[PDB]
mmCIF file of C-alpha atoms in Angstrom:
data_model
loop_
_atom_site.group_PDB
_atom_site.id
_atom_site.type_symbol
_atom_site.label_atom_id
_atom_site.label_comp_id
_atom_site.label_asym_id
_atom_site.label_seq_id
_atom_site.Cartn_x
_atom_site.Cartn_y
_atom_site.Cartn_z
ATOM 1 C CA UNK A 19 -6.365 5.612 7.492
ATOM 2 C CA UNK A 20 -7.457 1.958 6.510
ATOM 3 C CA UNK A 21 -8.440 0.490 3.306
ATOM 4 C CA UNK A 22 -11.645 -0.084 2.268
ATOM 5 C CA UNK A 23 -13.264 -3.195 1.007
ATOM 6 C CA UNK A 24 -16.449 -4.139 -1.483
ATOM 7 C CA UNK A 25 -18.489 -6.891 -0.934
ATOM 8 C CA UNK A 26 -19.964 -9.525 -3.096
ATOM 9 C CA UNK A 27 -23.529 -8.158 -3.331
ATOM 10 C CA UNK A 28 -21.233 -4.814 -4.074
ATOM 11 C CA UNK A 29 -21.202 -2.257 -0.601
ATOM 12 C CA UNK A 30 -18.460 -0.841 -0.116
ATOM 13 C CA UNK A 31 -17.687 -0.983 4.381
ATOM 14 C CA UNK A 32 -14.383 0.772 5.738
ATOM 15 C CA UNK A 33 -13.499 1.377 9.652
ATOM 16 C CA UNK A 34 -13.027 4.985 10.364
ATOM 17 C CA UNK A 35 -10.460 6.511 12.483
ATOM 18 C CA UNK A 36 -13.106 8.443 14.188
ATOM 19 C CA UNK A 37 -15.212 5.705 16.387
ATOM 20 C CA UNK A 38 -17.251 4.491 13.720
ATOM 21 C CA UNK A 39 -16.969 1.368 10.985
ATOM 22 C CA UNK A 40 -19.720 3.238 8.349
ATOM 23 C CA UNK A 41 -21.220 0.092 5.901
ATOM 24 C CA UNK A 42 -22.285 2.698 2.590
ATOM 25 C CA UNK A 43 -23.598 1.754 -0.342
ATOM 26 C CA UNK A 44 -22.823 2.753 -3.790
ATOM 27 C CA UNK A 45 -24.255 6.239 -4.119
ATOM 28 C CA UNK A 46 -22.778 7.626 -0.990
ATOM 29 C CA UNK A 47 -26.215 7.070 1.598
ATOM 30 C CA UNK A 48 -25.199 4.943 4.760
ATOM 31 C CA UNK A 49 -26.698 1.666 4.689
ATOM 32 C CA UNK A 50 -25.917 1.245 8.717
ATOM 33 C CA UNK A 51 -22.823 2.203 11.461
ATOM 34 C CA UNK A 52 -21.423 -0.101 14.326
ATOM 35 C CA UNK A 53 -19.916 1.868 15.970
ATOM 36 C CA UNK A 54 -16.220 0.472 19.002
ATOM 37 C CA UNK A 55 -14.879 1.375 22.030
ATOM 38 C CA UNK A 56 -12.029 3.210 19.851
ATOM 39 C CA UNK A 57 -11.171 3.848 16.022
ATOM 40 C CA UNK A 58 -10.358 1.034 13.838
ATOM 41 C CA UNK A 59 -7.223 0.404 12.155
ATOM 42 C CA UNK A 60 -7.703 -2.928 10.714
ATOM 43 C CA UNK A 61 -9.574 -3.462 6.538
ATOM 44 C CA UNK A 62 -12.173 -5.612 7.614
ATOM 45 C CA UNK A 63 -12.934 -9.485 5.386
ATOM 46 C CA UNK A 64 -15.547 -10.768 4.764
ATOM 47 C CA UNK A 65 -16.152 -14.859 5.615
ATOM 48 C CA UNK A 66 -17.736 -17.032 2.810
ATOM 49 C CA UNK A 67 -20.613 -16.699 4.433
ATOM 50 C CA UNK A 68 -21.237 -12.607 4.134
ATOM 51 C CA UNK A 69 -20.024 -12.627 7.669
ATOM 52 C CA UNK A 70 -18.203 -8.521 7.773
ATOM 53 C CA UNK A 71 -15.062 -9.294 10.614
ATOM 54 C CA UNK A 72 -13.006 -6.517 11.298
ATOM 55 C CA UNK A 73 -10.529 -5.730 14.109
ATOM 56 C CA UNK A 74 -10.864 -2.980 16.197
ATOM 57 C CA UNK A 75 -8.896 -0.917 18.554
ATOM 58 C CA UNK A 76 -10.930 -1.404 21.655
ATOM 59 C CA UNK A 77 -9.810 -4.903 22.140
ATOM 60 C CA UNK A 78 -12.664 -6.361 20.805
ATOM 61 C CA UNK A 79 -12.953 -8.825 17.687
ATOM 62 C CA UNK A 80 -16.846 -7.961 15.856
ATOM 63 C CA UNK A 81 -18.366 -9.950 13.554
ATOM 64 C CA UNK A 82 -21.814 -7.909 11.454
ATOM 65 C CA UNK A 83 -23.815 -10.082 9.506
ATOM 66 C CA UNK A 84 -24.960 -7.553 6.495
ATOM 67 C CA UNK A 85 -27.982 -7.407 7.612
ATOM 68 C CA UNK A 86 -25.667 -4.942 10.568
ATOM 69 C CA UNK A 87 -26.433 -6.945 13.621
ATOM 70 C CA UNK A 88 -24.014 -8.032 15.021
ATOM 71 C CA UNK A 89 -23.297 -12.768 14.835
ATOM 72 C CA UNK A 90 -20.812 -11.949 17.836
ATOM 73 C CA UNK A 91 -17.836 -10.631 20.071
ATOM 74 C CA UNK A 92 -14.506 -11.820 21.007
ATOM 75 C CA UNK A 93 -12.807 -10.269 23.786
ATOM 76 C CA UNK A 94 -8.536 -10.355 23.300
ATOM 77 C CA UNK A 95 -6.289 -8.140 26.754
ATOM 78 C CA UNK A 96 -5.582 -5.057 24.070
ATOM 79 C CA UNK A 97 -6.285 -2.979 20.433
ATOM 80 C CA UNK A 98 -6.187 -5.374 16.979
ATOM 81 C CA UNK A 99 -4.181 -3.778 14.244
ATOM 82 C CA UNK A 100 -4.504 -6.558 11.922
ATOM 83 C CA UNK A 101 -6.740 -7.658 9.071
ATOM 84 C CA UNK A 102 -8.166 -11.146 10.242
ATOM 85 C CA UNK A 103 -7.567 -14.506 7.955
ATOM 86 C CA UNK A 104 -10.293 -17.453 7.628
ATOM 87 C CA UNK A 105 -9.248 -20.361 6.655
ATOM 88 C CA UNK A 106 -10.862 -23.213 4.280
ATOM 89 C CA UNK A 107 -12.742 -24.072 7.167
ATOM 90 C CA UNK A 108 -14.539 -20.667 7.979
ATOM 91 C CA UNK A 109 -11.787 -21.016 11.591
ATOM 92 C CA UNK A 110 -11.587 -17.584 12.267
ATOM 93 C CA UNK A 111 -7.808 -16.383 12.122
ATOM 94 C CA UNK A 112 -6.635 -12.766 13.974
ATOM 95 C CA UNK A 113 -3.655 -12.411 16.582
ATOM 96 C CA UNK A 114 -3.215 -8.759 19.442
ATOM 97 C CA UNK A 115 -1.412 -7.161 20.496
ATOM 98 C CA UNK A 116 -1.062 -9.058 23.432
ATOM 99 C CA UNK A 117 0.819 -10.858 21.735
ATOM 100 C CA UNK A 118 -1.629 -13.661 21.569
ATOM 101 C CA UNK A 119 -2.558 -15.649 17.998
ATOM 102 C CA UNK A 120 -6.289 -16.457 17.940
ATOM 103 C CA UNK A 121 -8.428 -19.315 16.801
ATOM 104 C CA UNK A 122 -12.121 -18.016 16.571
ATOM 105 C CA UNK A 123 -14.583 -20.586 16.017
ATOM 106 C CA UNK A 124 -17.140 -19.662 13.021
ATOM 107 C CA UNK A 125 -20.244 -19.690 15.837
ATOM 108 C CA UNK A 126 -18.213 -17.623 18.109
ATOM 109 C CA UNK A 127 -16.081 -19.548 20.603
ATOM 110 C CA UNK A 128 -12.786 -19.444 21.119
ATOM 111 C CA UNK A 129 -10.697 -23.272 19.730
ATOM 112 C CA UNK A 130 -7.488 -22.183 20.827
ATOM 113 C CA UNK A 131 -4.850 -19.730 22.306
ATOM 114 C CA UNK A 132 -0.866 -19.442 21.024
ATOM 115 C CA UNK A 133 2.021 -16.227 22.545
ATOM 116 C CA UNK A 134 4.516 -15.060 21.215
ATOM 117 C CA UNK A 135 6.524 -12.987 23.358
ATOM 118 C CA UNK A 136 5.318 -9.430 21.859
ATOM 119 C CA UNK A 137 2.496 -7.818 19.965
ATOM 120 C CA UNK A 138 1.133 -9.242 16.885
ATOM 121 C CA UNK A 139 1.415 -6.855 14.311
ATOM 122 C CA UNK A 140 0.644 -8.424 10.814
ATOM 123 C CA UNK A 141 -2.260 -10.731 9.235
ATOM 124 C CA UNK A 142 -0.998 -14.192 9.806
ATOM 125 C CA UNK A 143 -0.986 -16.361 6.468
ATOM 126 C CA UNK A 144 -2.227 -20.114 6.223
ATOM 127 C CA UNK A 145 -0.213 -22.421 4.663
ATOM 128 C CA UNK A 146 -1.370 -25.122 1.093
ATOM 129 C CA UNK A 147 -1.193 -27.533 3.753
ATOM 130 C CA UNK A 148 -3.399 -25.377 6.282
ATOM 131 C CA UNK A 149 -0.866 -24.148 9.066
ATOM 132 C CA UNK A 150 -0.864 -21.526 9.533
ATOM 133 C CA UNK A 151 2.386 -18.300 9.915
ATOM 134 C CA UNK A 152 2.336 -15.582 11.601
ATOM 135 C CA UNK A 153 5.539 -12.628 12.536
ATOM 136 C CA UNK A 154 5.654 -11.339 16.288
ATOM 137 C CA UNK A 155 7.292 -8.737 17.824
ATOM 138 C CA UNK A 156 9.822 -11.054 19.579
ATOM 139 C CA UNK A 157 11.564 -11.585 16.638
ATOM 140 C CA UNK A 158 10.495 -14.460 15.667
ATOM 141 C CA UNK A 159 8.257 -15.902 12.497
ATOM 142 C CA UNK A 160 6.211 -18.742 14.361
ATOM 143 C CA UNK A 161 4.566 -21.733 11.775
ATOM 144 C CA UNK A 162 1.417 -22.934 13.990
ATOM 145 C CA UNK A 163 -0.340 -26.344 13.631
ATOM 146 C CA UNK A 164 -4.412 -26.921 13.291
ATOM 147 C CA UNK A 165 -4.237 -27.941 16.427
ATOM 148 C CA UNK A 166 -3.324 -24.902 17.890
ATOM 149 C CA UNK A 167 -0.502 -26.520 18.619
ATOM 150 C CA UNK A 168 3.873 -25.106 17.585
ATOM 151 C CA UNK A 169 5.282 -26.048 14.273
ATOM 152 C CA UNK A 170 8.654 -24.284 14.534
ATOM 153 C CA UNK A 171 9.422 -20.784 15.597
ATOM 154 C CA UNK A 172 12.464 -19.080 13.929
ATOM 155 C CA UNK A 173 14.477 -16.122 15.399
ATOM 156 C CA UNK A 174 15.493 -13.013 14.119
ATOM 157 C CA UNK A 175 17.700 -9.952 15.633
ATOM 158 C CA UNK A 176 13.784 -7.804 15.703
ATOM 159 C CA UNK A 177 10.842 -7.100 15.109
ATOM 160 C CA UNK A 178 8.789 -8.626 12.049
ATOM 161 C CA UNK A 179 6.597 -5.792 11.272
ATOM 162 C CA UNK A 180 4.869 -7.345 8.280
ATOM 163 C CA UNK A 181 3.092 -10.524 6.745
ATOM 164 C CA UNK A 182 5.347 -13.860 5.511
ATOM 165 C CA UNK A 183 4.788 -14.532 2.131
ATOM 166 C CA UNK A 184 4.633 -17.872 0.447
ATOM 167 C CA UNK A 185 5.715 -19.398 -2.932
ATOM 168 C CA UNK A 186 4.826 -21.074 -5.624
ATOM 169 C CA UNK A 187 7.934 -24.423 -3.516
ATOM 170 C CA UNK A 188 6.335 -23.585 -0.188
ATOM 171 C CA UNK A 189 8.591 -21.391 0.907
ATOM 172 C CA UNK A 190 8.376 -18.690 3.085
ATOM 173 C CA UNK A 191 9.727 -15.327 2.815
ATOM 174 C CA UNK A 192 9.643 -12.807 5.924
ATOM 175 C CA UNK A 193 10.878 -9.234 6.329
ATOM 176 C CA UNK A 194 12.654 -8.596 9.368
ATOM 177 C CA UNK A 195 13.306 -5.434 10.952
ATOM 178 C CA UNK A 196 16.807 -7.051 11.186
ATOM 179 C CA UNK A 197 17.775 -6.275 7.718
ATOM 180 C CA UNK A 198 17.884 -9.532 6.979
ATOM 181 C CA UNK A 199 15.121 -11.198 4.457
ATOM 182 C CA UNK A 200 14.540 -14.210 5.407
ATOM 183 C CA UNK A 201 13.866 -17.751 3.571
ATOM 184 C CA UNK A 202 12.771 -20.683 5.167
ATOM 185 C CA UNK A 203 11.818 -23.522 4.185
ATOM 186 C CA UNK A 204 8.849 -25.980 5.322
ATOM 187 C CA UNK B 6 11.295 -26.112 9.773
ATOM 188 C CA UNK B 7 14.750 -24.839 8.679
ATOM 189 C CA UNK B 8 16.621 -21.800 7.123
ATOM 190 C CA UNK B 9 16.971 -21.657 3.603
ATOM 191 C CA UNK B 10 19.193 -19.140 3.641
ATOM 192 C CA UNK B 11 19.472 -14.985 4.838
ATOM 193 C CA UNK B 12 20.282 -11.594 2.587
ATOM 194 C CA UNK B 13 21.556 -8.827 4.339
ATOM 195 C CA UNK B 14 19.895 -4.426 3.646
ATOM 196 C CA UNK B 15 20.978 -1.920 5.507
ATOM 197 C CA UNK B 16 17.828 -0.924 6.949
ATOM 198 C CA UNK B 17 14.633 -2.215 8.247
ATOM 199 C CA UNK B 18 11.841 -4.233 6.353
ATOM 200 C CA UNK B 19 9.122 -2.393 7.239
ATOM 201 C CA UNK B 20 6.727 -4.137 4.934
ATOM 202 C CA UNK B 21 6.214 -6.812 3.129
ATOM 203 C CA UNK B 22 8.157 -8.749 0.266
ATOM 204 C CA UNK B 23 6.727 -9.473 -3.936
ATOM 205 C CA UNK B 24 6.852 -12.613 -5.628
ATOM 206 C CA UNK B 25 6.629 -11.893 -9.642
ATOM 207 C CA UNK B 26 5.790 -14.733 -11.817
ATOM 208 C CA UNK B 27 9.596 -16.073 -12.158
ATOM 209 C CA UNK B 28 9.874 -16.851 -8.392
ATOM 210 C CA UNK B 29 11.572 -13.665 -8.277
ATOM 211 C CA UNK B 30 11.070 -11.981 -5.267
ATOM 212 C CA UNK B 31 11.028 -8.583 -4.665
ATOM 213 C CA UNK B 32 11.351 -6.482 -1.323
ATOM 214 C CA UNK B 33 11.404 -2.723 -0.292
ATOM 215 C CA UNK B 34 14.248 -1.645 2.675
ATOM 216 C CA UNK B 35 13.568 1.371 4.684
ATOM 217 C CA UNK B 36 17.745 2.086 3.525
ATOM 218 C CA UNK B 37 16.153 2.999 0.269
ATOM 219 C CA UNK B 38 16.494 0.430 -2.297
ATOM 220 C CA UNK B 39 14.565 -1.811 -3.958
ATOM 221 C CA UNK B 40 16.110 -5.827 -3.351
ATOM 222 C CA UNK B 41 15.552 -7.905 -6.714
ATOM 223 C CA UNK B 42 16.314 -11.711 -4.628
ATOM 224 C CA UNK B 43 16.547 -14.647 -7.265
ATOM 225 C CA UNK B 44 15.433 -18.015 -5.350
ATOM 226 C CA UNK B 45 19.242 -19.046 -5.177
ATOM 227 C CA UNK B 46 19.311 -16.169 -2.401
ATOM 228 C CA UNK B 47 21.826 -14.516 -4.487
ATOM 229 C CA UNK B 48 20.849 -10.533 -4.962
ATOM 230 C CA UNK B 49 20.009 -10.040 -9.277
ATOM 231 C CA UNK B 50 20.172 -6.012 -9.135
ATOM 232 C CA UNK B 51 19.142 -3.482 -6.902
ATOM 233 C CA UNK B 52 17.696 -0.442 -7.628
ATOM 234 C CA UNK B 53 18.672 2.721 -6.172
ATOM 235 C CA UNK B 54 15.740 5.262 -3.383
ATOM 236 C CA UNK B 55 15.605 8.901 -2.096
ATOM 237 C CA UNK B 56 14.707 8.122 1.114
ATOM 238 C CA UNK B 57 13.078 4.407 1.536
ATOM 239 C CA UNK B 58 10.740 2.686 0.442
ATOM 240 C CA UNK B 59 7.687 2.081 2.561
ATOM 241 C CA UNK B 60 4.819 -0.527 1.199
ATOM 242 C CA UNK B 61 5.395 -3.516 -0.449
ATOM 243 C CA UNK B 62 5.918 -3.090 -3.932
ATOM 244 C CA UNK B 63 3.844 -4.023 -6.769
ATOM 245 C CA UNK B 64 4.252 -5.460 -10.114
ATOM 246 C CA UNK B 65 1.393 -5.513 -13.103
ATOM 247 C CA UNK B 66 0.671 -7.790 -16.223
ATOM 248 C CA UNK B 67 3.709 -5.866 -18.007
ATOM 249 C CA UNK B 68 6.187 -7.162 -15.586
ATOM 250 C CA UNK B 69 6.636 -3.714 -14.290
ATOM 251 C CA UNK B 70 7.747 -3.476 -10.858
ATOM 252 C CA UNK B 71 5.388 -0.600 -9.207
ATOM 253 C CA UNK B 72 6.883 1.541 -5.717
ATOM 254 C CA UNK B 73 6.384 4.479 -4.060
ATOM 255 C CA UNK B 74 9.124 6.392 -2.254
ATOM 256 C CA UNK B 75 9.158 8.023 1.259
ATOM 257 C CA UNK B 76 11.311 10.258 -0.789
ATOM 258 C CA UNK B 77 8.246 11.829 -2.609
ATOM 259 C CA UNK B 78 8.397 9.615 -6.176
ATOM 260 C CA UNK B 79 6.473 6.587 -7.384
ATOM 261 C CA UNK B 80 9.371 4.236 -9.488
ATOM 262 C CA UNK B 81 8.467 2.172 -12.716
ATOM 263 C CA UNK B 82 11.986 0.027 -12.400
ATOM 264 C CA UNK B 83 12.219 -2.217 -15.270
ATOM 265 C CA UNK B 84 13.532 -6.211 -14.497
ATOM 266 C CA UNK B 85 16.178 -5.471 -15.920
ATOM 267 C CA UNK B 86 17.174 -3.536 -12.897
ATOM 268 C CA UNK B 87 16.950 -0.102 -15.016
ATOM 269 C CA UNK B 88 14.290 2.898 -14.586
ATOM 270 C CA UNK B 89 11.518 3.462 -16.724
ATOM 271 C CA UNK B 90 10.557 6.626 -15.509
ATOM 272 C CA UNK B 91 9.873 8.853 -12.117
ATOM 273 C CA UNK B 92 6.595 10.579 -11.216
ATOM 274 C CA UNK B 93 7.119 13.053 -8.779
ATOM 275 C CA UNK B 94 4.279 14.046 -5.940
ATOM 276 C CA UNK B 95 5.011 16.360 -3.189
ATOM 277 C CA UNK B 96 5.254 14.310 -0.072
ATOM 278 C CA UNK B 97 5.670 10.672 0.886
ATOM 279 C CA UNK B 98 3.957 7.938 -0.886
ATOM 280 C CA UNK B 99 2.976 5.486 2.569
ATOM 281 C CA UNK B 100 1.119 3.556 0.731
ATOM 282 C CA UNK B 101 1.257 0.630 -1.423
ATOM 283 C CA UNK B 102 0.991 1.571 -5.854
ATOM 284 C CA UNK B 103 -2.082 0.246 -7.072
ATOM 285 C CA UNK B 104 -3.146 -1.037 -10.840
ATOM 286 C CA UNK B 105 -6.566 -0.836 -12.621
ATOM 287 C CA UNK B 106 -8.007 -2.860 -15.572
ATOM 288 C CA UNK B 107 -6.558 -0.380 -18.434
ATOM 289 C CA UNK B 108 -2.847 -0.567 -16.177
ATOM 290 C CA UNK B 109 -3.643 3.515 -15.297
ATOM 291 C CA UNK B 110 -1.446 3.377 -11.741
ATOM 292 C CA UNK B 111 -2.770 4.429 -8.627
ATOM 293 C CA UNK B 112 -0.633 5.761 -5.016
ATOM 294 C CA UNK B 113 -1.785 7.691 -2.943
ATOM 295 C CA UNK B 114 0.413 10.459 -0.352
ATOM 296 C CA UNK B 115 1.453 12.648 2.325
ATOM 297 C CA UNK B 116 0.735 15.567 0.018
ATOM 298 C CA UNK B 117 -2.916 14.769 0.447
ATOM 299 C CA UNK B 118 -2.956 14.408 -3.974
ATOM 300 C CA UNK B 119 -4.351 10.854 -4.650
ATOM 301 C CA UNK B 120 -2.656 10.404 -8.565
ATOM 302 C CA UNK B 121 -3.841 8.573 -11.406
ATOM 303 C CA UNK B 122 -0.430 7.522 -13.265
ATOM 304 C CA UNK B 123 -0.289 6.566 -17.317
ATOM 305 C CA UNK B 124 0.743 3.383 -18.078
ATOM 306 C CA UNK B 125 4.117 5.644 -19.717
ATOM 307 C CA UNK B 126 4.535 6.849 -15.961
ATOM 308 C CA UNK B 127 2.574 9.982 -17.835
ATOM 309 C CA UNK B 128 0.546 11.799 -15.710
ATOM 310 C CA UNK B 129 -3.948 11.171 -16.411
ATOM 311 C CA UNK B 130 -4.826 13.862 -13.563
ATOM 312 C CA UNK B 131 -4.379 14.922 -10.301
ATOM 313 C CA UNK B 132 -7.014 14.847 -6.970
ATOM 314 C CA UNK B 133 -6.821 16.387 -3.617
ATOM 315 C CA UNK B 134 -7.589 15.596 -0.749
ATOM 316 C CA UNK B 135 -7.182 17.446 2.810
ATOM 317 C CA UNK B 136 -4.765 15.818 5.087
ATOM 318 C CA UNK B 137 -2.037 13.447 3.685
ATOM 319 C CA UNK B 138 -3.173 10.139 1.757
ATOM 320 C CA UNK B 139 -1.895 6.442 4.408
ATOM 321 C CA UNK B 140 -4.672 3.799 2.798
ATOM 322 C CA UNK B 141 -3.527 2.465 -0.149
ATOM 323 C CA UNK B 142 -7.190 3.560 -2.981
ATOM 324 C CA UNK B 143 -9.710 0.030 -3.557
ATOM 325 C CA UNK B 144 -11.408 -0.252 -7.500
ATOM 326 C CA UNK B 145 -14.250 -1.861 -7.459
ATOM 327 C CA UNK B 146 -16.103 -3.573 -9.840
ATOM 328 C CA UNK B 147 -17.702 -1.250 -11.970
ATOM 329 C CA UNK B 148 -14.105 1.057 -12.507
ATOM 330 C CA UNK B 149 -14.672 2.899 -9.333
ATOM 331 C CA UNK B 150 -11.785 4.344 -7.793
ATOM 332 C CA UNK B 151 -11.445 4.432 -4.001
ATOM 333 C CA UNK B 152 -9.898 6.727 -2.095
ATOM 334 C CA UNK B 153 -9.263 6.335 2.077
ATOM 335 C CA UNK B 154 -9.404 8.504 5.205
ATOM 336 C CA UNK B 155 -7.163 12.008 4.152
ATOM 337 C CA UNK B 156 -9.393 13.197 6.991
ATOM 338 C CA UNK B 157 -11.890 11.470 7.998
ATOM 339 C CA UNK B 158 -13.275 12.082 4.551
ATOM 340 C CA UNK B 159 -13.421 8.729 3.013
ATOM 341 C CA UNK B 160 -13.173 9.683 -0.992
ATOM 342 C CA UNK B 161 -14.811 7.863 -3.806
ATOM 343 C CA UNK B 162 -13.188 9.443 -7.032
ATOM 344 C CA UNK B 163 -14.580 9.431 -10.684
ATOM 345 C CA UNK B 164 -11.439 7.074 -14.064
ATOM 346 C CA UNK B 165 -11.899 10.038 -14.816
ATOM 347 C CA UNK B 166 -10.712 12.420 -12.200
ATOM 348 C CA UNK B 167 -14.227 13.812 -10.518
ATOM 349 C CA UNK B 168 -15.435 12.838 -7.964
ATOM 350 C CA UNK B 169 -18.516 11.203 -7.159
ATOM 351 C CA UNK B 170 -19.052 11.987 -3.209
ATOM 352 C CA UNK B 171 -16.879 12.465 -0.172
ATOM 353 C CA UNK B 172 -17.410 10.619 3.338
#
């Protein structure tokens, strides 16, 4: 039940609730498919270099080349329910149900991990200055530095289920399950 | 790193806020209402909806805010807080509305019917899928309308309501 994406070459990609992750053409013929251990919930993200990245309920984030060949796999504790985010330097950001935020080098290795108390259910957002913002189900909004360390965490009551938004003045706005909207300064 | 302000609503906020060209912040609540809040934290207006707003609201180039609802309607809201028009679907709308090149508003529905709505709110056409549609539609370069996994069969919908292929 995910949204599909279109490539810089016009290809249509989508994850399927019946396990596979088809890569279709505009005419409808199957170009190739790539099956994962479980159904795919996240919508795929196409990197600047054309690499297609997508999460999976099997706990792995996969990197697939335009030609269908696997570039690498990255193991996380639990399923990935949110689309990954690519930064300017190409670093892929992703969160898992195990409560960690991961920064994966485009070559397939881990750069750093950062833990939150509960699962991370939504994609992180990278600020204009490179700061990575992400919500945790532990009720806090985390601001994580490019170096993998914490800059600050902001407490809410209930879980944060959705990605924050950055205004022109840099203010971070995010909805909480506790009923409040918050606006946080850098 | 500090709190600038907080604005209390009745129920949980499931979806992300959206910001307009003038800095206005719009955010849906599970208490039914759509809240419009200023950069200074004050309430500009709120719109009344029957059950809940599930997905994030979207704004067209015309400045009109479009939002789905768990009560089954799709709403067009005027920047002044009044209703521009509404549109009824059979079941709740889970997906955020999508606005194309020509201003047509697209949205899924838990009634299994992909809708396209003219800028003025009149129905352009409906297309029936098998099961509920939860994914937001996507539009390609050539205007092709794409729809989510209604029942494990992705659809490619033509601009004129007809179909290209299923999957």
